[PDB]
Design a protein around this ligand. Structure first.
Ligand SMILES: [Ca+2]
Length: 472
């Protein structure tokens, strides 16, 4: 592998970060010594590995640990915890009974517990009963957050004494997933395959803890041959309201080596912004998430109603919605109002079976004309000559003349009420004939004839004449 190095004593601080207690002390570059905790109460100091570890390759950890100058009976505590978890390179475990492993998720490793915790918290299960007041080295199951000691791995160790450094070797087989830890003559072996659940890259922490009891806890001549894990960029494609719209695109690569992400073209959506990490960058030991936000594409549909008689817009409806959704708009309601008001529908290009908003705009038109109802009014001009005696009694039947009929069209607008009259056409003529008055036997008439009356119009008034007959 290319991502595969050996961390030398002289470069300890390059690859390890002094946290809590340890950050008060400078790595002595003559002894190659790093203080985790001093001989003081309520301490908590760790070294977190800056990178991560490929938990599928072969790593060999070498060094000497000073567990202090006091046993538990003599007021000595708490021990040295080795942490392996899949989480952040900066997350470290709870102190005391959790021994630098408990209270992280997906956590496992090896402790030298120089203090027997018999009373269990929510962060650690009681230490094994077969070790009451006795120092021991053990593997721990920290997956469910609660550090549980593997009672199989529980072998006794030499009490902390005179601040003496004992040899420590932790070796791991990638394919077997088997860890071999040797602390000064005692030897441990455990199958961590159960503990590297799926994630071939784990965070590393060496931690130390004091409480009421205390011990100077240090590390010396550290040698860590391992395969540096690869960084992992994650890329999400989501709408504005969180909901994912495209498959998340998890890449992976050597750290400080370019990663590149891609804006996805997404049917029904336009890119808005990239929240989280840069779309272009370099790879990093913790997991960088580039989200891609998209807007739900909205389509436009308008329906214009036009009075063709005025050539002017009656009303316009504007529908906007998501590319694919139904407007649930009908023209019949807005047509009804108009056809009620005395409009006649000319044309409707709006689809009968509803519309669907699309990426491209939709425009529909409804032409209505002011309804025109052609009527026909008829007028008639009449000539009636009555033939009477001086008493007002009838000498003869009234002559009712061939009537002069007139007719004009009357176009009526049902929207305005306006009446468009045509020209008063004459059906029968303009001239009333001459009417010679009857000759009654033994009478003489005041008018012997009624003269022809011409130039009668539809405006002309009915003629009402009267012939009076005198005796002899
Ligand atoms: Ca303990």
């Amino acid at each position: 592998t290319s991502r595969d190095i050996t961390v030398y004593p002289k470069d300890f601080l390059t690859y390890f970060q002094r946290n809590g207690s340890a950050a008060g002390f400078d790595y002595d570059l003559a002894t190659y010594t790093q203080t985790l905790t001093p001989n003081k109460a309520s301490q908590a100091g760790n070294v977190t590995l800056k990178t991560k570890v490929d938990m599928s390759q072969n790593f060999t950890f070498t060094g000497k640990i000073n567990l202090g100058d006091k046993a538990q009976n003599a007021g000595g505590a708490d021990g040295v915890g080795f942490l392996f978890h899949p989480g952040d390179t900066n997350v470290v475990g709870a102190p005391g009974g959790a021994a630098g492993i408990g209270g992280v998720n997906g956590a496992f490793g090896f402790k030298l517990d120089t203090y027997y915790n018999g009373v269990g918290e929510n962060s650690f299960t009681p230490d094994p009963s077969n070790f009451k007041g006795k120092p021991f080295g053990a593997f721990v199951d920290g997956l469910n957050g609660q550090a549980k000691t593997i009672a199989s791995s529980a072998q006794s160790i030499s009490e902390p004494s005179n601040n003496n450094f004992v040899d420590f070797t932790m070796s791991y087989n990638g394919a077997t997933k088997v860890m071999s830890v040797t602390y000064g003559g005692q030897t441990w072996t455990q199958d961590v395959s159960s503990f590297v659940g799926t994630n071939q890259a784990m965070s590393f922490s060496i931690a130390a803890s004091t409480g009421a009891f205390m011990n100077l806890q240090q590390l010396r001549n550290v040698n860590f041959t391992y395969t540096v894990a690869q960084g992992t960029v994650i890329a999400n494609y989501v709408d504005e309201q969180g909901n994912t719209i495209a498959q998340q695109e998890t890449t992976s690569g050597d750290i400080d080596t370019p990663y590149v992400t891609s804006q996805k073209t997404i049917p029904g959506y336009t890119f808005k912004a990239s929240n989280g990490a840069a779309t272009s960058g370099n790879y990093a030991a913790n997991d960088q998430t580039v989200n891609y936000v998209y807007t739900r594409n909205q389509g436009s549909i308008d329906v214009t109603y036009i009075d063709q008689t005025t050539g002017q817009t009656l009303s316009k409806k504007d529908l906007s919605g998501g590319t694919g959704d139904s407007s649930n708009y009908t023209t019949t309601d807005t047509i009804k109002s108009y056809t009620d008001a005395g409009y006649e529908l000319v044309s409707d290009n709006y689809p009968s079976g509803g519309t669907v908003f699309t990426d491209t705009a939709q425009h529909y038109v409804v032409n209505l004309k002011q309804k025109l109802v052609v009527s026909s009014e008829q007028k008639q001009v009449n000539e009636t000559i009555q033939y009477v005696y001086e008493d007002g009694s009838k000498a003869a039947d009234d002559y009712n003349a061939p009537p002069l009929n007139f007719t004009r069209s009357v176009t009526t607008n049902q929207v305005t009420g306006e009446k468009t009259y045509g020209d008063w056409q004459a059906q029968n003529g303009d001239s009333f004939g001459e009417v010679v008055s009857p000759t009654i036997k033994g009478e003489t008439a005041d008018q012997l004839k009624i003269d022809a009356i011409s130039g009668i119009t539809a405006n002309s008034a009915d003629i009402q004449k009267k012939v009076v007959y005198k005796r002899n």
